C-alpha cells in the first residue's frame, strides 16, 4: 500500500544490503534498485514498497539523511 | 567435544531435514553402511553453531559488563567475513539485553555487538569482539536493528578487497525485471 | 573513447591480452531473446535469469500454478543459434507453496559442478498470511555433464549420481528476519552458510 | 648545456673499445631460509590485535 | 591422444629489465638483463661488458633488484617470477667454479586478490628493513629482511587506495616509508605510509597527501642529502617533500610520455629520461647547501640528449656510457658527450643488440615483420644468420608473391595535424621513400608496400584512404582465373566511434612496378583474416566468417555464413576444414560442405580461452595460444551428435611467451614455427605414443639431477596456469630440458639413465637437436 523513493546510495550497495536495512521497519512487498545495462553497476537509487503506510513512514524517519557506507541517504516519497 | 557445536554426516546411493533426490523424484538411500572403493557416492555434511550458546558464553566470560546482563531478548546474526583456506567463519553478533547500569539502581535495556570468529575444521568458536553497552532510549526494535545491519554494511565496505575474475559467487535473480542478460567475459549481451 | 582497433593492435605488441582493458568498451554480441527462443516454450512463460559462469549455457525457471511448482532450466546458448533445452529439474521436491517465491540461482568461486536455489517468500502462513515468520527454500542442484561420461552413457534421461542429483531443504526463521548474504555464504567452496535465525548451519555437499 | 662531469667508477671501464655461458645448476642444494605468506586473513589479524591489546589494558589494572 | 614436443629455434631478445651493483664481487660493477626467463650476468670491464653467465629462471622476470643487507660482503638479488616465485640469490665463486646460491625462496601468491593494471611492482627499502611488494589491489605484502630466522613471515596490510599507478621506498626515513601516486574519481594523487613490522600495519606517512597531474605515471625515490620524491607526468615534473614543492611544465615533454627513468649519479642530482618517441632527456636536480650542512632542491631542469631506441630501460654505466634496453626495437650502448654532431646531438650509438620482437607476423628461410614505430623492420633467418630491413615505420603483415618475386607488406606511420591542410609525416619512411607510389580511389596512415624479394628495396607504396586501417593480407590465386593477387582487408577507424562497422576488401595486381586496383567489395565491418580456401577467398568479418567465390567479371560474390562468433580475429585451413580463433570465445572447427553450398559447425572447445593464435596440426589435432601465456591442443571427441561437437583439451603446457603467429615451416613429425612479442622463435613438432613415453621419463629424470635457481620446481613452471585454474603439464615435452641432457657431465648422465645407457640417450637427443 506505501512505496519509497531510496537515493543517494554508494554504487557497491546490493538489494540484499538495502532489503537488511529496510526490513526491520515492516513487511516489504517489492524492492527494485535501478541497475545500469550498459557497465553492469548500481545506479545508487531505487524504490522499496511496504505492505504498511506507517511502517513505511518510520523506514523514512529513521534512514533519510543517515549515512550508509559516506554517503547520507535520501529517503523519499512518490507520485 | 564441545556443546556449542552438533555434526551430522550421510551417505547416499541410487539440524535441517534433508530431501536429497535424483533429477526425477527418488530419495535415494538414506545411510552410513559399506560401499567399498571409491564407487560414485554422495556425502552431506551439517555443522550447527547455536548462536544461544555462545552468546551465553561470551557474556559469561569474555565481557567486561557481565556481571551487570540480566537476560538478552532478540539477536541479530550477520557475517562479516569467510576465510576458505583457514576454514574461519566471522560472525558479528547484534544483542538486545537486559542489564544494570554502573553503580551511578534499576535495569535498563540496551544493545550491543559480539564478534566471533568460528572455525570449521575444529567446530570451536573464539571471541574477538564486545562491545560496549549502548541504551536503548525512545528507539524501536526496527530502529536499532536498521542501525546495526548499516554498521555491518559499512565494516564490510571498509575491508572490501577486490576478488579475482573467477573466484566471484554468481548471483542471478530476474522479478516479473532485467533488461540484459551478460557474459561480462565474452561481451555477449541478450537483450530481453 | 579508444576504438578497438586501436585497443588490438597494442596487443600484438604488447603481449597484454585481457578483459580488465576492454572493460570500457560496448558488447562485441548483442542478440535479443526472442529470436534465439524456441516457439514451443511461449505457451510456458519462462524466466530468463542469466548466463552461467562459463557462457555455455542460460538459465531460466518457471513458476507453475493452487500449490506453486518451480522449474529450473538449462539452455545451450550459440550466439545467434536457437537455445536447445539440456535439463529441467523440479524444484523444492513434494514441497507444497502457498505464495510466490522471490528466488535466486547462484554459482560457487570454483565449483561448477552444483548450483544453489535460495527461495523466500515476502511472509509465511498458516491459507491465510502469518507475520512474525518466513519459509526459506534451499535446493543444491547437479549441473549437466562437461563432455562425455562414461558413467552417464550407463543408461536404461538417465544420469548418473556426479552429474545427476539433487538436495533439498527449509527452514522457518523469525524476527528481525535474517540478511541473505550470497557471496559470504558461498565463499568456502563446496559449503552454504545457513542463517536458520537460532543458528549458523554449515551445509557441505560432495560426490566421491 | 649540463652534461659534463658524469660518474666515474674507474677510469678503464670504457677506454679500450669493443665492436654469456649457460649456467646448468649441477646436483649441489645448500638453502636454509624460506619465504611464507600470513594464514589469517587481514580483518581477522587486526580484531584480534584490537582485542588482545585490550586484553592487556584489562591485565594491568587488575 | 596427442603427444608434442616444444623447443627453443631463438631465446627471447626483447629487454624488460637492467639493474647495476656490485653481485659477483664487492670490486665489480655488474649489469644484470632481463630478457622474459633469461638472466644475463656481466662484468664492467676496461674493454666494455664481460659476459660471466647466463642463467635461464624457470620463470618469467618480474622484480630484478639488488639490496645489501648490513654484514653482506657484496649485493644480493632479489628475484620475483610471473607465478610468484620469490627468491634472495647469492653469487658465489671458487676459483673456477661459479655457483648461484638461493638464500631464501617460497611461493608469494595470494588465492584472493585481483593483479593490478600497472602489474607487479616489487621495491626494497633502502636499508634493507624490508622488501614491499604490490601484486594486487587493495593489498601491500610486505617480506621482512630479517637473517636471524627460519622463515621470513610475509602478510599483507590494506590499501584504501585501490588503483595504485607507481609506489616506491623513501630515502632517509626512520621509519620505512612508502610513496605512491594513485588513482580515484576525484583524479590523481601523491601519499606516503609508514610500514610498521611490530604492528604489522600503515602508519600516517611523512608529509601530506598532495593532488597530482592526470596523467602522472611514474615515482623516483630521490636520495639524500636531497631526499623526498620525483613525480614524472605528461606535462609536468614535480618534487615533493614534507613542506617543499617544486613545479616544472616544460614544453619539450608534452609530445610523448616518459616511460623509464635512471639515477645517473649516486646523490640523485642527475637523471635519464626515455620517452615513447626514443627521446632522451637528463633531469637536473640544482642543490643548494644550507649553513645547517644540510642540501636542498634549489630547481629542476629537463634537456633533451638526443635519441636512442624506444626505451623500456635505461641503465648509466660507467664514463659517459648508457644501456638503452629495448622492447620494441634493438638495445644499444649510448656514449653521451658535452659537445653536440651535425644534428645537433650529444648521443652517439656505440652498439646495437639484435631484438626481433615483437614478432607481428612472419613467411617460410624465416621473414617477420618486426618491431614497431621508427623501430618497424624486417628481418630474415636463416641457419642463426639475421638481416635486418629498417622500415621507420610499424610493419603489420607480411605475403610472399613468387610469380611477382616480392613481398607484399602492411604497414602504418604517424602523421600529425598541423595548422594548414591536412597530416604531415614527422620522420621518413618506407611508405613515404619508395620508387614508385599509388592512393586508393596524431593519425595512423595505412599503406600495401611492395618489396623486392632480393635487394627488399620499397618497389611501391599504396596508400589506404583517409582513415582506413589494413588488418589482413593473402597472395593467392582465386577460382578459374590465372592470375595471382594481394588481397587486403580493411576498416574504417574514425574519431567518433569504438567500433569498425565499414571495411573493404580489395583486389590488387601488381605489374610493370605499379599496384592496379582489379576489384573492390564493401563489408559491413571489420575484414580481421582472410585464407585462401580452395580456389575461394574465406574472410572473417567482425563476428561472421565468410566465403567468397570469384566470378569470371572479377567480382567476389558471397557463397555462405556463419555467424556464431563473438570476435572471429584468426583463421586457419586443411582440407575442407576450418578453425576459428575468437578473441574471447576460445577455438571451433567448421566445414564446408561442398554439395550444400555452406558451412557446418563441427565442434568448439568450451573452455573459456582468450586466444593470440591458432594452428591445424593435423586432420584431429589443434593447437591454441592464449592470453595467459600458454599452448593447449585440442582433439576431436573418438557415438551421439553432441559427443562429436566437443572439442577436447589434450594437451597443456605453459609456454612463457605471448605467440602472435604461428606457421608450418624418424623421431618428430610436423614442424610448426612460432613468433612471440619478445622475440623469442619456437618449434613444435608431433611424437608417437614410445617417443612421448621415453622423453616423459627422461624429463622426470633430469630434474632429480639439473637444480633450479631459486628453487623453482620445472613442473610447476610447466603446469597450465590462468586466473581461473592451474593443471599439471599434459602431452607436451619441453624440448629445451631434454637438450640441456648433452650438456651434464658424463657421471651425471649415467644417473639420469640408472635402471638404457648413456650413448642411447646421447643418440637420441643428438637427432632431436637437429630438428632447429
Ligand atoms: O554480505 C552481504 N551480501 S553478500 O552478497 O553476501 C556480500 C558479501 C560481501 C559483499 Br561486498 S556482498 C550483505 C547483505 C545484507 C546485509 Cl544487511 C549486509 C551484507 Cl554485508
Ligand atoms: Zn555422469
Same mark, same amino acid.
Given at each position: 500500500?506505501?512505496?519509497?523513493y531510496?537515493?543517494?546510495?554508494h554504487?557497491?550497495?546490493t538489494?540484499?544490503?538495502?532489503?537488511?536495512?529496510?526490513?526491520?521497519?515492516?513487511?516489504?512487498?517489492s524492492?527494485?534498485?535501478?541497475?545500469?545495462?550498459?557497465?553492469?553497476?548500481?545506479?545508487?537509487?531505487?524504490?522499496?514498497?511496504?505492505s504498511?503506510?506507517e511502517?513505511?513512514?518510520?523506514?523514512?524517519?529513521?534512514?533519510n539523511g543517515?549515512?550508509?557506507?559516506?554517503?547520507p541517504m535520501?529517503?523519499?516519497?512518490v507520485? | 567435544?564441545?556443546?556449542?557445536?552438533?555434526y551430522?554426516?550421510?551417505?547416499?546411493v541410487?539440524?535441517?531435514?534433508?530431501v536429497?533426490?535424483?533429477?526425477?523424484?527418488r530419495?535415494?538411500?538414506?545411510?552410513?553402511?559399506?560401499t567399498a572403493?571409491?564407487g560414485q557416492?554422495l556425502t552431506?555434511?551439517?555443522?550447527?553453531?547455536?548462536?544461544e550458546?555462545?552468546?551465553?558464553?561470551?557474556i559469561?566470560?569474555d565481557?567486561t559488563?557481565?556481571?551487570?546482563?540480566?537476560?538478552?531478548?532478540?539477536?541479530?546474526?550477520?557475517?562479516?567475513?569467510?576465510?576458505?583456506?583457514?576454514?574461519?567463519?566471522?560472525?558479528?553478533?547484534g544483542?538486545l539485553?537486559?542489564?544494570?547500569?554502573?553503580?551511578?539502581?534499576?535495569?535498563?535495556?540496551?544493545?550491543?555487538?559480539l564478534?566471533?570468529?568460528?572455525?570449521?575444521?575444529?567446530?570451536?568458536?573464539?571471541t574477538?569482539?564486545?562491545?560496549?553497552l549502548?541504551?536503548?532510549?525512545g528507539?524501536?526494535?526496527?530502529?536499532?536493528?536498521?542501525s546495526?545491519?548499516?554498521?555491518?554494511?559499512?565494516?564490510?565496505?571498509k575491508?572490501?578487497?577486490?576478488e579475482?575474475?573467477?573466484?566471484?559467487?554468481?548471483?542471478?535473480?530476474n522479478?516479473?525485471?532485467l533488461?540484459v542478460?551478460?557474459?561480462?567475459?565474452?561481451?555477449?549481451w541478450?537483450?530481453l | 573513447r579508444?576504438?578497438v582497433?586501436?585497443?588490438?593492435?597494442?596487443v600484438k605488441?604488447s !603481449?597484454? @591480452?585481457?578483459?580488465?582493458?576492454?572493460?570500457?568498451?560496448?558488447?562485441?554480441?548483442?542478440?535479443?531473446?526472442?529470436?534465439i527462443?524456441?516457439?514451443?516454450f511461449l505457451?510456458?512463460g519462462?524466466?530468463?535469469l !542469466?548466463?552461467?559462469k562459463? !557462457?555455455?549455457?542460460?538459465?531460466?525457471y518457471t513458476?507453475?500454478?493452487?500449490? =506453486?511448482? =518451480?522449474? @529450473?532450466?538449462?539452455?545451450e546458448?550459440?550466439?545467434?543459434?536457437?537455445?536447445?533445452?539440456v535439463?529441467?529439474?523440479?524444484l523444492f521436491?513434494?514441497?507444497?507453496?502457498?505464495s510466490?517465491?522471490?528466488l535466486?540461482?547462484?554459482?560457487?568461486?570454483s565449483?561448477?559442478?552444483?548450483?544453489?536455489?535460495?527461495?523466500?517468500?515476502?511472509?509465511?502462513?498458516?491459507?491465510?498470511?502469518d507475520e512474525?515468520?518466513?519459509?526459506?527454500?534451499?535446493?543444491?542442484?547437479?549441473?549437466?555433464?562437461? !563432455?562425455r561420461?562414461?558413467?552417464?552413457?550407463?543408461?536404461?534421461?538417465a544420469?548418473?549420481?556426479?552429474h545427476?542429483?539433487?538436495?533439498?531443504?527449509?527452514?522457518?526463521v523469525? =524476527?528481525?528476519?535474517?540478511?541473505?548474504?550470497?557471496?559470504?555464504? @558461498?565463499?568456502?567452496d563446496?559449503?552454504?552458510? @545457513?542463517?536458520?535465525?537460532?543458528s549458523?548451519?554449515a551445509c557441505?555437499?560432495?560426490?566421491h | 648545456?649540463?652534461?659534463?662531469?658524469?660518474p666515474?667508477?674507474?677510469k678503464?671501464?670504457?677506454?679500450?673499445?669493443?665492436?654469456?655461458?649457460?649456467?646448468?645448476?649441477?646436483?649441489e642444494?645448500?638453502?636454509e631460509?624460506?619465504?611464507?605468506?600470513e594464514?589469517?586473513?587481514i580483518?581477522?589479524?587486526?580484531?584480534?590485535?584490537?582485542?588482545?591489546?585490550?586484553?592487556a589494558?584489562?591485565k594491568r589494572?587488575? | 591422444?596427442?603427444?608434442?614436443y616444444?623447443?627453443?629455434?631463438?631465446?627471447?631478445?626483447?629487454?624488460?629489465?637492467?639493474?647495476?651493483?656490485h653481485?659477483?664481487?664487492?670490486?665489480?660493477?655488474?649489469?644484470l638483463?632481463?630478457?622474459?626467463?633469461?638472466?644475463?650476468?656481466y662484468?664492467?670491464?676496461?674493454?666494455?661488458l664481460?659476459?660471466?653467465?647466463?642463467?635461464?629462471?624457470?620463470?618469467?622476470?618480474?622484480?630484478?633488484?639488488?639490496?645489501?643487507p648490513?654484514?653482506?660482503?657484496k649485493?644480493?638479488?632479489?628475484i620475483?617470477?610471473?607465478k610468484?616465485?620469490?627468491?634472495?640469490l647469492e653469487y658465489k665463486?671458487?676459483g673456477?667454479?661459479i655457483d648461484?646460491?638461493?638464500?631464501?625462496?617460497?611461493?608469494?601468491?595470494?588465492?584472493?586478490?585481483?593483479?593490478?593494471?600497472?602489474?607487479?611492482?616489487?621495491?626494497?627499502?633502502?636499508?634493507?628493513?624490508?622488501?614491499?611488494?604490490?601484486?594486487?589491489?587493495?593489498?601491500?605484502?610486505?617480506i621482512?629482511?630479517?637473517?636471524?630466522?627460519?622463515?621470513l613471515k610475509?602478510?599483507?596490510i590494506?590499501?584504501e587506495?585501490?588503483?595504485?599507478?607507481?609506489?616506491?621506498?623513501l630515502?632517509?626515513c626512520?621509519?620505512?616509508?612508502?610513496?605512491?601516486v594513485?588513482?580515484?574519481?576525484?583524479?590523481?594523487?601523491?601519499?606516503?605510509?609508514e610500514?610498521?613490522?611490530?604492528?604489522?600495519?600503515?602508519?600516517?606517512?611523512?608529509?601530506?597527501?598532495?593532488?597530482?597531474?592526470?596523467?602522472?605515471?611514474?615515482?623516483?625515490?630521490?636520495?639524500?642529502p636531497?631526499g623526498?620524491?620525483?613525480?614524472i607526468?605528461?606535462?609536468?615534473?614535480?618534487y615533493?617533500?614534507?613542506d617543499?614543492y617544486?613545479?616544472?611544465?616544460?614544453?619539450?615533454?608534452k609530445?610523448?610520455?616518459?616511460?623509464?627513468?635512471?639515477?645517473?649519479?649516486?646523490?640523485?642530482?642527475?637523471?635519464?629520461?626515455?620517452?615513447?618517441?626514443?627521446?632522451?632527456?637528463?633531469?637536473?636536480?640544482?642543490?643548494?647547501?644550507?649553513?645547517?650542512?644540510?642540501?636542498?632542491?634549489?630547481?629542476?631542469?629537463?634537456?633533451?640528449?638526443?635519441?636512442?631506441?624506444?626505451?623500456?630501460?635505461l641503465?648509466?654505466?660507467?664514463?659517459?656510457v648508457?644501456?638503452?634496453?629495448?622492447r620494441?626495437?634493438?638495445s644499444q650502448?649510448?656514449?653521451?658527450?658535452?659537445?653536440?654532431?651535425?644534428?645537433?646531438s650529444?648521443?652517439?650509438?656505440?652498439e646495437?643488440?639484435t631484438?626481433?620482437?615483437?614478432?607481428?607476423?612472419?613467411?617460410?628461410?624465416?621473414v617477420t615483420?618486426?618491431?614497431?614505430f621508427?623501430?618497424?623492420?624486417?628481418?630474415?633467418?636463416?641457419?642463426?644468420?639475421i638481416?635486418t630491413?629498417?622500415?621507420?615505420?610499424?610493419?603489420?603483415?607480411?605475403?610472399y608473391?613468387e610469380?611477382s618475386?616480392?613481398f607484399?607488406?602492411?604497414?602504418?606511420?604517424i602523421?600529425?595535424?598541423?595548422?594548414?591542410?591536412?597530416?604531415?609525416?614527422?620522420?621518413?619512411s618506407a611508405?613515404?621513400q619508395?620508387?614508385?607510389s599509388?592512393?586508393s580511389?596524431?593519425?595512423?596512415?595505412?599503406?600495401l608496400?611492395?618489396?623486392?624479394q632480393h635487394?627488399?628495396?620499397?618497389?611501391?607504396?599504396?596508400?589506404f584512404?583517409?582513415?582506413?586501417?589494413?588488418?589482413?593480407?593473402?597472395?593467392?590465386?582465386?577460382?578459374?582465373?590465372?592470375?595471382?593477387?594481394?588481397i587486403?582487408?580493411?576498416?574504417?577507424?574514425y574519431?567518433?566511434?569504438?567500433?569498425?562497422?565499414?571495411?573493404?576488401?580489395?583486389?590488387?595486381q601488381?605489374?610493370?612496378?605499379?599496384?592496379?586496383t582489379?576489384?573492390?567489395?564493401?563489408?559491413?565491418?571489420?575484414?580481421?583474416?582472410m585464407?585462401e580456401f &580452395?580456389?575461394?577467398?574465406?574472410?572473417?568479418?567482425?563476428?561472421?566468417?565468410?566465403?567468397?567465390?570469384?566470378?569470371?567479371?572479377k567480382?567476389?560474390?558471397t557463397?555462405c555464413?556463419?555467424?556464431?562468433?563473438?570476435?572471429?580475429?584468426?583463421?586457419?585451413?586443411?582440407?575442407d576444414?576450418?578453425?576459428?580463433?575468437?578473441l574471447?570465445?576460445?577455438?571451433?572447427?567448421?566445414?564446408?560442405?561442398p554439395?550444400?553450398?555452406?558451412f557446418?559447425?563441427?565442434?568448439r572447445?568450451?573452455?573459456p580461452? +582468450?586466444?593470440?593464435?591458432?594452428?591445424? /596440426?593435423?586432420?584431429?589435432?589443434?593447437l591454441?595460444?592464449?592470453?595467459?601465456?600458454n599452448?593447449?591442443?585440442?582433439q576431436?571427441?573418438?557415438?551421439?551428435?553432441?559427443?562429436?561437437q566437443?572439442?577436447?583439451?589434450?594437451?597443456?603446457?605453459?609456454?612463457?611467451?605471448?605467440?602472435?603467429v604461428?606457421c608450418?615451416?624418424?623421431?618428430t613429425?610436423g614442424?610448426?614455427?612460432?613468433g612471440?612479442? &619478445?622475440?623469442?622463435?619456437?618449434?613444435?613438432?608431433? /611424437?608417437?605414443?614410445? +617417443?612421448y613415453?621415453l622423453?616423459?621419463?627422461?624429463? &622426470?629424470? /633430469?630434474?632429480?639431477?639439473?637444480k633450479?635457481?631459486?628453487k623453482?620446481?620445472?613442473?610447476?613452471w610447466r603446469?597450465?596456469?590462468?586466473?581461473?585454474?592451474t593443471?599439471?603439464?599434459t602431452?607436451f615435452?619441453?624440448?629445451?630440458?631434454?637438450?640441456s641432457?648433452?650438456?651434464?657431465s658424463?657421471?651425471?648422465?649415467?644417473?639420469?639413465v640408472?635402471?638404457a645407457?648413456?650413448?642411447?640417450?646421447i643418440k637420441?637427443?643428438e637427432? /632431436?637437436?637437429?630438428?632447429?
Open positions: 500500500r506505501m512505496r519509497l531510496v537515493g543517494s546510495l554504487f557497491n550497495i538489494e540484499d544490503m538495502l532489503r537488511g536495512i529496510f526490513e526491520p521497519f515492516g513487511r516489504i512487498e524492492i527494485q534498485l535501478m541497475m545500469d545495462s550498459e557497465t553492469g553497476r548500481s545506479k545508487g537509487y531505487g524504490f522499496i514498497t511496504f504498511d503506510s511502517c513505511a513512514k518510520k523506514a523514512l524517519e529513521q534512514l543517515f549515512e550508509l557506507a559516506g554517503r535520501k529517503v523519499g516519497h507520485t | 567435544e564441545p556443546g556449542y557445536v552438533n551430522t554426516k550421510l551417505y547416499y541410487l539440524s535441517l531435514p534433508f536429497v533426490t535424483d533429477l526425477r523424484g530419495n535415494l538411500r538414506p545411510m552410513r553402511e559399506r572403493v571409491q557416492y552431506v555434511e551439517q555443522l550447527t553453531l547455536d548462536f550458546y555462545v552468546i551465553n558464553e561470551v559469561r566470560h565481557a559488563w557481565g556481571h551487570q546482563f540480566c537476560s538478552f531478548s532478540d539477536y541479530d546474526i550477520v557475517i562479516l567475513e569467510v576465510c576458505p583456506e583457514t576454514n574461519q567463519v566471522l560472525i558479528n553478533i544483542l539485553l537486559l542489564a544494570f547500569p554502573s553503580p551511578t539502581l534499576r535495569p535498563k535495556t540496551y544493545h550491543t555487538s564478534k566471533v570468529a568460528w572455525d570449521l575444521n575444529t567446530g570451536i568458536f573464539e574477538v569482539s564486545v562491545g560496549d549502548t541504551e536503548v532510549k528507539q524501536t526494535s526496527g530502529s536499532v536493528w536498521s546495526y545491519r548499516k554498521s555491518c554494511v559499512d565494516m564490510v565496505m575491508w572490501l578487497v577486490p579475482s575474475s573467477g573466484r566471484y559467487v554468481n548471483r542471478m535473480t522479478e516479473a525485471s533488461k542478460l551478460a557474459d561480462s567475459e565474452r561481451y555477449t541478450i537483450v | 579508444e576504438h582497433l586501436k585497443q588490438l593492435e597494442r605488441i !603481449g597484454q @591480452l585481457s578483459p580488465r582493458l576492454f572493460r570500457k568498451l560496448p558488447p562485441r554480441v548483442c542478440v535479443s531473446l526472442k529470436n527462443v524456441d516457439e514451443d505457451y510456458a519462462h524466466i530468463f !542469466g548466463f552461467s562459463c !557462457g555455455r549455457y542460460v538459465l531460466s513458476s507453475s500454478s493452487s500449490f =506453486y511448482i =518451480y522449474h @529450473l532450466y538449462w539452455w546458448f550459440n550466439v545467434h543459434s536457437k537455445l536447445k533445452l535439463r529441467q529439474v523440479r521436491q513434494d514441497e507444497e507453496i502457498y510466490d517465491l522471490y535466486t540461482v547462484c554459482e560457487w568461486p565449483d561448477a559442478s552444483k548450483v544453489i536455489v535460495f527461495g523466500f517468500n515476502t511472509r509465511s502462513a498458516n491459507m491465510m498470511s512474525n515468520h518466513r519459509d526459506i527454500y534451499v535446493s543444491t542442484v547437479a549441473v549437466p555433464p562437461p !563432455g561420461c562414461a558413467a552417464c552413457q550407463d543408461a536404461s534421461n544420469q548418473c549420481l556426479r545427476g542429483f539433487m538436495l533439498h531443504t527449509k527452514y522457518q523469525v =524476527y528481525p528476519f535474517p540478511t541473505f548474504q550470497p557471496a559470504f555464504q @558461498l565463499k568456502k563446496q559449503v552454504v552458510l @545457513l542463517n536458520t535465525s537460532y549458523l548451519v557441505a555437499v560432495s560426490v | 648545456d649540463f652534461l659534463k662531469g658524469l666515474v667508477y674507474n678503464s671501464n670504457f677506454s679500450r673499445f669493443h665492436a654469456p655461458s649457460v649456467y646448468l645448476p649441477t646436483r642444494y645448500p638453502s631460509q624460506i619465504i611464507v605468506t594464514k589469517t586473513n580483518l581477522l589479524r587486526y580484531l584480534h590485535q584490537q582485542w588482545d591489546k585490550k586484553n589494558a584489562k589494572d587488575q | 591422444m596427442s603427444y608434442n616444444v623447443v627453443t629455434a631463438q631465446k627471447p631478445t626483447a629487454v624488460n629489465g637492467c639493474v647495476t651493483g653481485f659477483t664481487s664487492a670490486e665489480d660493477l655488474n649489469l638483463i632481463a630478457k622474459n626467463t633469461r638472466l644475463e650476468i662484468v664492467v670491464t676496461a674493454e666494455g664481460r659476459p660471466v653467465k647466463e642463467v635461464g629462471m624457470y620463470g618469467k622476470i618480474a622484480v630484478m633488484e639488488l639490496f645489501r648490513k654484514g653482506e660482503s649485493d644480493l638479488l632479489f620475483l617470477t610471473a610468484y616465485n620469490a627468491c634472495i665463486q671458487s673456477e667454479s648461484i646460491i638461493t638464500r631464501a625462496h617460497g611461493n608469494v601468491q595470494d588465492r584472493i586478490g585481483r593483479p593490478s593494471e600497472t602489474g607487479i611492482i616489487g621495491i626494497i627499502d633502502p636499508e634493507c628493513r624490508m622488501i614491499g611488494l604490490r601484486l594486487y589491489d587493495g593489498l601491500f605484502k610486505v621482512p629482511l630479517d637473517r636471524d630466522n627460519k622463515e610475509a602478510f599483507n590494506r590499501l587506495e585501490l588503483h595504485v599507478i607507481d609506489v616506491k621506498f630515502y632517509g626512520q621509519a620505512p616509508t612508502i610513496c605512491f594513485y588513482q580515484d574519481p576525484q583524479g590523481r594523487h601523491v601519499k606516503t605510509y610500514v610498521s613490522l611490530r604492528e604489522k600495519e600503515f602508519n600516517k606517512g611523512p608529509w601530506k597527501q598532495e593532488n597530482v597531474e592526470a596523467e602522472a605515471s611514474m615515482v623516483i625515490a630521490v636520495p639524500e636531497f623526498g620524491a620525483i613525480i607526468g605528461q606535462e609536468s615534473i614535480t615533493h617533500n614534507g617543499k617544486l613545479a616544472i611544465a616544460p614544453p619539450i615533454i609530445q610523448s610520455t616518459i616511460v623509464c627513468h635512471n639515477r645517473v649519479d649516486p646523490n640523485g642530482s642527475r637523471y635519464l629520461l626515455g620517452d615513447m618517441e626514443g627521446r632522451l632527456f637528463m633531469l637536473l636536480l640544482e642543490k643548494e647547501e644550507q649553513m645547517d650542512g644540510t642540501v636542498t632542491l634549489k630547481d629542476l631542469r629537463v634537456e633533451l640528449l638526443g635519441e636512442t631506441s624506444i626505451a623500456e630501460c641503465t648509466y654505466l660507467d664514463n659517459g648508457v644501456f638503452v634496453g629495448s620494441l626495437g634493438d650502448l649510448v656514449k653521451l658527450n658535452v659537445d653536440s654532431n651535425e644534428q645537433g650529444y648521443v652517439v650509438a656505440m646495437t643488440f631484438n626481433l620482437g615483437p614478432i607481428v607476423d612472419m613467411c617460410v628461410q624465416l615483420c618486426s618491431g614497431a621508427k623501430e618497424g623492420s624486417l628481418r630474415i633467418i636463416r641457419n642463426l644468420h638481416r630491413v629498417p622500415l621507420y615505420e610499424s610493419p603489420r603483415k607480411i605475403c608473391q610469380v618475386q616480392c607484399g607488406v602492411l604497414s602504418s606511420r602523421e600529425v595535424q598541423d595548422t594548414s591542410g591536412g597530416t604531415t609525416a614527422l620522420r621518413p611508405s613515404t619508395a620508387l614508385s599509388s592512393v580511389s596524431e593519425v595512423e596512415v595505412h599503406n608496400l611492395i618489396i623486392d635487394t627488399f628495396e620499397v618497389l611501391h607504396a599504396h596508400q584512404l583517409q582513415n582506413e586501417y589494413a588488418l589482413s593480407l593473402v597472395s593467392c590465386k582465386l577460382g578459374k582465373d590465372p592470375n595471382t593477387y594481394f587486403v582487408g580493411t576498416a574504417m577507424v574519431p567518433e566511434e569504438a567500433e569498425p562497422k565499414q571495411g573493404r576488401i580489395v583486389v590488387f601488381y605489374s610493370d612496378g605499379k599496384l592496379q582489379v576489384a573492390e567489395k564493401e563489408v559491413k565491418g571489420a575484414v580481421y583474416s585464407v &580452395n580456389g575461394k577467398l574465406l574472410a572473417s568479418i567482425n563476428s561472421t566468417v565468410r566465403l567468397y567465390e570469384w566470378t569470371t567479371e567480382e567476389l560474390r557463397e555464413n556463419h555467424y556464431n562468433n563473438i570476435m572471429a580475429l584468426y583463421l586457419k585451413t586443411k582440407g576444414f576450418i578453425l576459428v580463433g575468437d574471447m570465445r576460445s577455438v571451433l572447427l567448421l566445414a564446408y560442405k554439395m550444400e553450398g555452406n557446418e559447425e563441427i565442434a572447445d568450451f573452455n580461452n +582468450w586466444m593470440s593464435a591458432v594452428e591445424i /596440426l593435423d586432420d584431429d589435432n589443434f591454441g595460444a592464449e592470453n595467459a601465456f599452448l593447449f591442443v585440442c576431436k571427441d573418438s557415438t551421439t551428435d553432441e559427443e562429436r566437443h572439442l577436447q583439451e589434450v594437451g597443456l603446457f605453459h609456454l612463457g611467451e605471448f605467440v602472435n604461428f608450418h615451416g624418424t623421431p613429425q614442424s610448426v614455427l612460432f612471440t612479442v &619478445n622475440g623469442m622463435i619456437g618449434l613444435v613438432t608431433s /611424437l608417437s605414443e614410445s +617417443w613415453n622423453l616423459l621419463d627422461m624429463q &622426470n629424470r /633430469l630434474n632429480k639431477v639439473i633450479s635457481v631459486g623453482i620446481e620445472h613442473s610447476f603446469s597450465f596456469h590462468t586466473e581461473r585454474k593443471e599439471p603439464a602431452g615435452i619441453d624440448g629445451d630440458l631434454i637438450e641432457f648433452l650438456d651434464i658424463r657421471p651425471k648422465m649415467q644417473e639420469v640408472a635402471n645407457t648413456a650413448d642411447d640417450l637420441v637427443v637427432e /632431436l637437436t637437429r630438428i632447429h
